[PDB]
Amino acid sequence: SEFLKASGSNFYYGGQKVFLSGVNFAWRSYGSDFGNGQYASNGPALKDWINKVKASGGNTARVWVHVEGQVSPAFDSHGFVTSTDSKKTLINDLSDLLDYANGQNVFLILVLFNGALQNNSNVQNLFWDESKLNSYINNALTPMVNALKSKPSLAAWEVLNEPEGTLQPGSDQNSCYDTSTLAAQGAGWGGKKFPMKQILKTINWISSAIHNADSKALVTVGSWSELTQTDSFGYRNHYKDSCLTGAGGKSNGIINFYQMHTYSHSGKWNQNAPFKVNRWAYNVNDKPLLIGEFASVCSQNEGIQNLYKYAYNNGYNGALTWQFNSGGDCSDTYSNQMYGMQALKGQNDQSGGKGGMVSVNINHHHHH
Ligand SMILES: OC[C@H]1O[C@@H](O[C@H]2[C@H](O)[C@H](O)[C@H](O[C@H]3[C@H](O)[C@H](O)[C@H](O[C@H]4[C@H](O)[C@H](O)[C@H](O[C@H]5[C@H](O)[C@H](O)[C@H](O)O[C@@H]5CO)O[C@@H]4CO)O[C@@H]3CO)O[C@@H]2CO)[C@@H](O)[C@@H](O)[C@@H]1O
Numbered sequence: 001s002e003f004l005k006a007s008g009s010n011f012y013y014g015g016q017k018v019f020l021s022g023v024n025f026a027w028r029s030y031g032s033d034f035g036n037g038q039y040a041s042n043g044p045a046l047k048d049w050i051n052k053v054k055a056s057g058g059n060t061a062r063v064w065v066h067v068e069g070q071v072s073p074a075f076d077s078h079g080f081v082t083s084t085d086s087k088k089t090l091i092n093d094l095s096d097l098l099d100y101a102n103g104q105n106v107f108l109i110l111v112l113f114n115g116a117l118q119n120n121s122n123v124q125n126l127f128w129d130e131s132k133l134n135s136y137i138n139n140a141l142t143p144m145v146n147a148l149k150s151k152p153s154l155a156a157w158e159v160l161n162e163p164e165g166t167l168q169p170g171s172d173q174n175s176c177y178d179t180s181t182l183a184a185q186g187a188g189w190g191g192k193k194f195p196m197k198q199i200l201k202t203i204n205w206i207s208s209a210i211h212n213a214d215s216k217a218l219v220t221v222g223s224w225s226e227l228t229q230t231d232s233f234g235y236r237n238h239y240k241d242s243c244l245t246g247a248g249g250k251s252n253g254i255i256n257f258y259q260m261h262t263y264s265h266s267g268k269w270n271q272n273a274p275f276k277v278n279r280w281a282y283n284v285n286d287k288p289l290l291i292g293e294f295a296s297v298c299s300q301n302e303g304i305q306n307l308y309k310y311a312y313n314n315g316y317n318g319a320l321t322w323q324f325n326s327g328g329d330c331s332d333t334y335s336n337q338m339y340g341m342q343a344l345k346g347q348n349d350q351s352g353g354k355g356g357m358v359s360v361n362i363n364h365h366h367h368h
């Protein structure tokens with residue numbers, strides 16, 4: 001009945017402005033958490049993680065799905081998509097996890113494809129071939145969105161994670177496509193495959209589809225750094241409406257809330273990083289802005305609870321600590337994550353400018 005909405009600059013549940021406080025699961029098994037009957041293996045862990053999330057007083061978990069095509073989606077011999085997975089179980093798994101997350105009053109952000117790295121030749125061609133992308137939409141995505149759109153706790157689909165990881169930086173007259181600066185900033189660290197035009201086209205079309213199947217659905221993109229989603233500081237905001245729509249005429253092919261990832265390189269913030277500024281200077285009040293991904297290990301050592309508090313105080317609509325499974329570089333431990341989540345526990349400060357309601361009470365389905 002009531003689903004998380006995005007209005008103006010804020011998230012809203014049941015009218016009450018909400019602040020997304022939680023963690024990245026990102027995964028239990030990289031790229032094989034759902035689909036091909038793999039959910040039987042990872043499921044218990046993920047559910048338990050949702051438990052920890054709620055007990056620590058959080059409301060959101062960010063979970064990756066397709067990732068690098070290891071299970072999702074199913075391609076044929078020609079690189080066209082046939083189904084969600086070979087065993088056709090993906091939708092059931094996701095649906096299940098959504099049910100549990102709801103039962104524990106936790107929202108989920110389903111990240112479709114990875115973009116930091118994408119070493120799958122079929123997924124890589126989804127950016128270039130329109131018919132293959134359409135095959136993915138028709139045979140995989142549209143069924144997923146259609147089947148899962150009646151689920152609260154499904155608060156947003158993220159089309160692409162860090163599209164700058166596999167960006168091919170280059171010059172272009174069109175503001176949106178030009179990437180002249182990003183090369184020196186360290187973009188394309190996963191290999192320079194996709195020019196900005198192709199990424200914006202892809203995202204355009206994915207988001208378009210998701211919204212065609214689900215008018216309410218919140219679509220987003222989670223970027224490496226802030227250099228990509230703000231017009232201030234001489235930077236550029238590529239994933240706003242005009243640019244996306246500019247790449248592939250889908251008017252509704254737009255994200256509904258921006259998102260920035262941030263880490264300290266050498267223990268030094270980027271000068272204009274989310275924690276050295278506030279939401280407001282990024283001049284993106286037309287949509288909400290979430291800080292998906294941050295780690296109190298790759299910060300300036302402000303303190304984890306101090307980082308959550310910073311996010312809640314300086315206008316940001318959410319803050320997600322980086323990976324709950326405690327693995328990789330620049331990742332907090334699940335314990336310290338829990339600790340930080342306890343900083344905004346049971347909080348509700350709807351006095352504007354401040355984060356808002358944290359502990360949300362989510363519905364079930366209406367059906368019929
Ligand atoms: O890197 C330095 C160099 O980069 C240059 O930019 C390159 C870029 O790096 C990529 O290599 C890119 O490669 C893509 C091609 O441009 C082209 O789009 C190609 O087309 C594919 C298509 O995506 C799809 O997969 C298609 O499916 C076929 C299928 O295989 C089967 O045959 C079936 O019967 O038909 C379907 C058709 O629907 O197969 C096509 C094969 O051609 O996809 C490539 C992806 O690797 O090219 C860029 C150049 O435009 C330049 O910037 C250069 O300046 C720079 O120095």
Ligand SMILES: OC[C@H]1O[C@@H](O[C@H]2[C@H](O)[C@H](O)[C@H](O[C@H]3[C@H](O)[C@H](O)[C@H](O[C@H]4[C@H](O)[C@H](O)[C@H](O)O[C@@H]4CO)O[C@@H]3CO)O[C@@H]2CO)[C@@H](O)[C@@H](O)[C@@H]1O
Pocket residue numbers: 184185186187189224225263265329330
């Ligand atoms: O999201 C974290 C993720 O980052 C990955 O790759 C990048 C990283 O994101 C970041 O962009 C980094 O940028 C470097 C850049 O490559 C140059 O070395 C740059 O230089 C600057 C120089 O030091 C001087 O200050 C000069 O004045 O200005 C130059 C910039 O014009 O320094 C940047 C430091 O921020 O590069 C890495 C890799 O290229 C991976 O690290 C990944 O593992 C990580 O999780």
Ligand SMILES: OC[C@H]1O[C@@H](O)[C@@H](O)[C@@H](O)[C@@H]1O
Pocket residue numbers: 116161162165224261293322328329330331
């Ligand atoms: O560091 C953890 C990793 O998380 C991923 O989501 C991307 O942000 C990568 O760039 C990063 O290396």
